[PDB]
Amino acid sequence: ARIIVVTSGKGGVGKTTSSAAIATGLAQKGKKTVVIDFAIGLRNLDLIMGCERRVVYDFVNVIQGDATLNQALIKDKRTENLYILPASQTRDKDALTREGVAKVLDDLKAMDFEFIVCDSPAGIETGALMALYFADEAIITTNPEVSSVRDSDRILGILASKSEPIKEHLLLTRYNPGRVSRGDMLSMEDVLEILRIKLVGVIPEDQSVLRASNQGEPVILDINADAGKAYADTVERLLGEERPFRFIEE
Amino acid sequence: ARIIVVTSGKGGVGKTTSSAAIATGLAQKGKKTVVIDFAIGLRNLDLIMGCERRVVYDFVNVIQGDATLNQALIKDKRTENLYILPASQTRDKDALTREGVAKVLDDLKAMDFEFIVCDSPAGIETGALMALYFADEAIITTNPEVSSVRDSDRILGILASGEEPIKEHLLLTRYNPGRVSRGDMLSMEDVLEILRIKLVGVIPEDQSVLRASNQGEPVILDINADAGKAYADTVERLLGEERPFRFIEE
Amino acid sequence: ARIIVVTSGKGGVGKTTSSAAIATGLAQKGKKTVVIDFAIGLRNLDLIMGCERRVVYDFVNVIQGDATLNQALIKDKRTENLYILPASQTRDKDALTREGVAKVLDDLKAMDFEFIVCDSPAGIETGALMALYFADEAIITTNPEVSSVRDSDRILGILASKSEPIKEHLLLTRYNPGRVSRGDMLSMEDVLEILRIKLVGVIPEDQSVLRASNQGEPVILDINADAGKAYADTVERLLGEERPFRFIEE
Amino acid sequence: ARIIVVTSGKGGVGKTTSSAAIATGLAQKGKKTVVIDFAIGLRNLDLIMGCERRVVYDFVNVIQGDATLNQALIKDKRTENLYILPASQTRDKDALTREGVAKVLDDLKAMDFEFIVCDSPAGIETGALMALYFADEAIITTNPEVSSVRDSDRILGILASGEEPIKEHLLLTRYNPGRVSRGDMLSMEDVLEILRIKLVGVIPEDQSVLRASNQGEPVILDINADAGKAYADTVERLLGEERPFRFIEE
Amino acid sequence: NTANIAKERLQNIVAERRRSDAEPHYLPQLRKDILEVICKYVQIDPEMVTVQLEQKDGDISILELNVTLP
Amino acid sequence: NTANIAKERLQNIVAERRRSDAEPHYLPQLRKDILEVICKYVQIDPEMVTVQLEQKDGDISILELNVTLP
Ligand SMILES: Nc1ncnc2c1ncn2[C@@H]1O[C@H](COP(=O)(O)OP(=O)(O)O)[C@@H](O)[C@H]1O
Ligand SMILES: Nc1ncnc2c1ncn2[C@@H]1O[C@H](COP(=O)(O)OP(=O)(O)O)[C@@H](O)[C@H]1O
Ligand SMILES: Nc1ncnc2c1ncn2[C@@H]1O[C@H](COP(=O)(O)OP(=O)(O)O)[C@@H](O)[C@H]1O
Ligand SMILES: Nc1ncnc2c1ncn2[C@@H]1O[C@H](COP(=O)(O)OP(=O)(O)O)[C@@H](O)[C@H]1O
Questions:
Q1: Nearest to B36 by CA among B97, B111, B121
Q2: Which residues pair with D25 in a beta bridge?
Q3: Which of A234, D109, F21, F65 is least surrounded by CB atoms within 10 angstroms?
Q4: In sequence order, what are the beta bridge partners of A2?
Q5: Do B and D touch, counting CB pairs below 8 Å (3 needed)?
Q6: How far, in Å, CA of A161 to CA of A159, rounded?
């Protein structure tokens, strides 16, 4: 089982959108996948997956033995092969213990999940550290913006102070080729020259993403959305298939 | 002295942009203002104010007596009457003490600051709780988006749980009237019917904001930017002047 | 502690060479020794000891409280038990106060120095008077030459206008037995019949002395140098051991 | 009248030998010359000129009006056209006044002296400063030795800190070509690369110099002495005649 | 053209971030403590007073610091 | 061959003496005061803790100091 953390440092770059679209895309490809919300007291994954109302037991409930993995897992109704483990809603920093999280991950491998997508919260503190700790891969989610690139670099410093190493990938999100050519936005290449890691995807700015979270329907399910198609390309690249980068030229 | 916290819960809604533009606008109006970065290990205020390279001592340095308020305060070079106290860069959650923050705030009142703008981090954890704790007013920063409205409501619950209570204001940010009328985006009124608080400003989606953080120049300084003008209106409303809401119709 | 001034009146007779070789020789014999440069504005001791580049604080810095004795003392790296206090570089006659010099000397006795070697400058003026003032012993350094013998006599007149008296010794330097027998140079006996004081050493003219100052290595450290051996004999005589005078016959 | 100071900083390099030999050489060439001892309390010029016993009145006696220039000047008996003004023997640093020295120099110009040779003492203090102050030219006297080259550089700094500046010349003294080629002694070129001034003479190490001061007979008078011949070359160069440098190769 | 300004501002910090992990935990603490202190006796803000660490092929270091005075 | 050692030792000083006249009477007083002070917290002797002043073609200066740590 491949444990993939979706991280960033900077808040509001597209971690949740990406964790959702990618977990769905992998499920569509017939790979049994679970996406876990690692947030502390803020439930945003269930809102984007559209299952905010089916949340009975959460990640912390399973760790403290108040519920089984079967009781807390929410099987997606729209896509076959997809499951969601939602976040706790306590203002509590601890809760998510290292031993606890490890026990949950082993149970999930035992349930034959191929992909365990960890939707990390913002920051460098507790929840974020816990989501990357057991990762095999990290998807560093970034915008062509100064705060986001600075905070992604801080996150790479934390992922690297671990010296099989965490395989790192850059997911450049909310890209706008037109803005890049008018000289108003950092280009894909500018971002790679700074955060020197392998590009795994480029998600264009798309008006389909607001419409997708409005409905609680991950953007990959909208077959006409450019952001959806770029997420399907990302999923291909995660499965080992080379794909040319679309939506980088106008 | 009016202590104003800029908060949100949700990451990447415009807290930093707003804290910067508002502190600047108040300074422009001749009011001696300081804007403080309450973040834990992520320095984003200095980046948006354009003084990332003049940062010698920070907020935690002053609390631990390694520096005076005079040594850590950065006087803005572009705008008269404006000062910046930057964030610490340690992963230490403890660092910011209640007693420590209170001592700093009293020293600032003693230095004759009229406005103390507290740029809060995301979340409901440590840094965010510390920024609102001593506030007289709170600017709840929100996008017309599902995750942001949910997380702003959680923050209102914390603000609400001796004296005149925290005066709350809604700063609706990244608004797009065209999107609202095509039925793709929650309207200003939809957001008010949910988070039932007084509207203090509406910041339109503006291509000037990316150009402003690229330069490290708060968007209110761009006299042609619609986001700049809407922030100048907000500053008027904070000073007690009624102003009609611009950029709400297309 | 024995305070020994190395004096002469005449310039360029071998005071510095002798102060250095003797201080080193005493250190070699396990006696904790310090050699002090009493010159005013000319630093020649540090050049001969080979520590011209480690000079941070000097004698006048210590007197004016700009540095501690520990900060100005240079511990020799080549010989154990040896220390150097270097000269000031101001054109200032005063500086070296009687009260100041006395305070330094008491601190050195307190640091358990057995031997305090005072490398006096030329002349009969300020620096030279200050170096002999607190002496317990004086080493009158002389060449078998007319100007040097005349100026040494003037210095004896000054040492004697003090009526435990200063113990005086003659250090006959740059001697050449071959020149003496061809009748071209005042003999050791001619010099004693004029300056009627106890002979403590005779340093032969030696090509090793130029090579020693070239390297910044006192000539006693060159175990093959005749001048080195004659300086080691001198050190024995200062420690109370009789030694036959070598290098007086050809 | 050309006022020439013979200076050095370092003691015992050959100032007196050079002042004497040069003043004599100029007198021999029919130029009416006076050589003045600027020393404070040490009479070494009269000893080398061989007139130590004809000294009645000195330089300070003339300044304080206790004697006329005619009463203090000693006409050399051995060489026509040569006169000596000897040094005072008081320890009084004040004695030599700027106004006093200037008055004496004007009287000497009025007596039709072509050359006024100022034999300066060692150091950078009073007597040395007074001898160079009114100079038209300076003869920096140096040995191929580390202390001497360091102290000559200090003197150049003082000479350099209205009219045509002091014309500076290097008189390299006690040179030994054999020692230079065996790599034991700084070469003429090494010394010029450090003290970057015009070479005016090179005086070889000569056993004739000790024999000359023994008799009180300047070394230029010994027609067989190499040092004498090199001083006669120097005198030619001072009179404007180019002469090849002898005694630089072995 | 603000994309170019963004790129330069970014490199100078991530070079800064790349650097902090090479330094010890005290050496940069002391420099900030005392070099900036020579403010009372000199007085300039950076405004670059540069700091650059180097190393030799012999497990040796070279902390050089430029002081560009206006 | 000690004439060569003498020559090198000499140039380092006369460069030092040639240098002292190029700058203010306080700037070198302060450096000696405080940079050597970081002895209590670091501890190394010069070891020419090098120091070099530079200038630009615009009445600007550049006091750089190298810190070669062993
Ligand atoms: N490709 C995109 N185009 C347009 N808006 C986007 C895109 N990706 C994300 N967004 C918007 O950016 C915001 C942040 O998305 P989100 O996934 O919630 O961020 P995060 O998980 O990092 O906090 C949301 O308001 C979302 O609508
Ligand atoms: N009015 C606006 N129009 C367009 N983009 C905006 C606007 N306000 C903010 N942004 C962008 O949204 C992102 C988040 O802004 P920021 O102020 O850093 O968020 P926060 O401080 O709340 O975490 C940035 O990329 C910023 O450029
Ligand atoms: N024994 C000796 N043989 C040869 N040269 C000597 C001897 N002693 C001293 N010298 C030389 O004589 C000069 C004066 O030596 P120095 O110690 O500097 O004199 P001072 O301290 O009295 O001014 C130097 O150039 C030195 O090389
Ligand atoms: N060319 C030379 N060859 C040999 N010995 C010399 C030579 N020049 C000077 N000396 C000797 O060097 C010593 C210093 O000479 P002196 O002229 O008295 O020095 P100063 O006047 O500079 O103090 C004397 O002992 C002198 O005999």
A1: B121
A2: none
A3: F21
A4: A115
A5: no
A6: 6
| Residue for token pair 């690249």 | A237
CATH of the domain at A102: 3.40.50.300
E37/F contact by beta carbon, under 8 A: yes
CA atoms of A124 and A161, how far apart (whole Å)? 13
**Is C93 annotated among the ligand-binding residues?**
no
Burial letters for D122-154: b for 16+ Cβ neighbours within 10 Å, e otherwise? bbbbbbbbbbbebbebbbbbbbbbbbbbbbbbb
Which helix (H) or strand (E) segment is D16 a member of?
A: helix D15-28
CB atoms within 10 A of CB C2: 16
Give the C-alpha separation, D249 to D245, whole Å: 9
F2-64 is classed CATH 3.30.1070.10: yes
Query: Which candidate from E26, E64, E69 shows the least CB-CB separation from F65?
Result: E64
3-state DSSP assignment of residue A76: coil
Selection from D195, D191, D207 nearest residue D245 by Cα = D191
DSSP result, A205-244: P-THHHHHHHHT--GGG-TT-HHHHHHHHHHHHHTT----
CATH code of E2-65, in short, is 3.30.1070.10
Query: Are the C-beta atoms of residues B19 and B117 closer than 8 Å to each other?
Result: yes
Residue type present at position B16: T
| Helices and strands, number each (H, E), in chain E | 2, 3
Residue B63 backbone phi and psi in degrees, to 5: -65, -40
Q: Yes or no: say if D215 and D187 are a contact pair by the CB < 8 Å rule.
A: no
Q: How many angstroms separate the CA atoms of C53 and A32, rounded?
A: 73
CA distance A63 to D130: 94
Radius of gyration of chain D, Cα coordinates, nearest whole angstrom: 17
DSSP structure class, residue B28? H
B168's CB contacts (< 8 A; 6+ apart) are B137, B138, B140, B156, B159, B197, B198
Task: Tell me the one-letter amino acid at D177.
Answer: P
Domain count, chain A: 1
User: How big is chain E by its Cα radius of gyration, in Å?
Assistant: 15
* Beta bridge pairs of residue A7: A140
Q: How far apart are CA F15 and CA A118, in angstroms?
A: 64
- What is the three-state SS of A2-27? EEEEEECCCCCCCHHHHHHHHHHHHH
CA separation for the pair A158, C150 (Å, rounded): 80
Give the C-alpha distances (Å, rounded to integers) separating B45 from A35, B87, B141.
33, 8, 16
Q: Which tokens sit at B186?
A: 């929650």
Kindly state whether E38 is in contact with chain A, defined as any CB-CB distance less than 8 angstroms.
no
- C113: which 2 tokens? 């120095």
Non-local CB neighbours of D207 within 8 Å, separated by 6+ positions: C179, C184
Residue D231 belongs to domain spanning: 1-250
Note if the bond before F47 is cis, omega within 30 degrees: yes
A113 vs A106: CA distance, rounded Å: 10
Q: Give resolution, Å, one decimal.
A: 4.3
Q: Cβ contacts of residue D236 below 8 Å, gap of 6+?
A: D243
Helices within C160-199 (DSSP H only): 177-181, 188-194
* D17 Cα: distance to centroid of ligand 4 (angstroms): 6
Q: For chain E, positions 10-29, list CB contacts with chain F under 8 A.
A: 26-27
Chain F CB within 8 Å of residue E45 CB: no
Task: Give the strand order in the sheet containing C137-142.
Answer: C74-75, C82-85, C33-37, C115-119, C2-7, C137-142, C167-175, C198-204
Nearest to D47 by CA among C10, C125, C176, C142: C10
B174: Cβ–Cβ under 8 A, 6 or more apart, which residues? B13, B14, B143, B144, B203, B204, B205
Q: Is B17 annotated as a binding residue?
A: yes
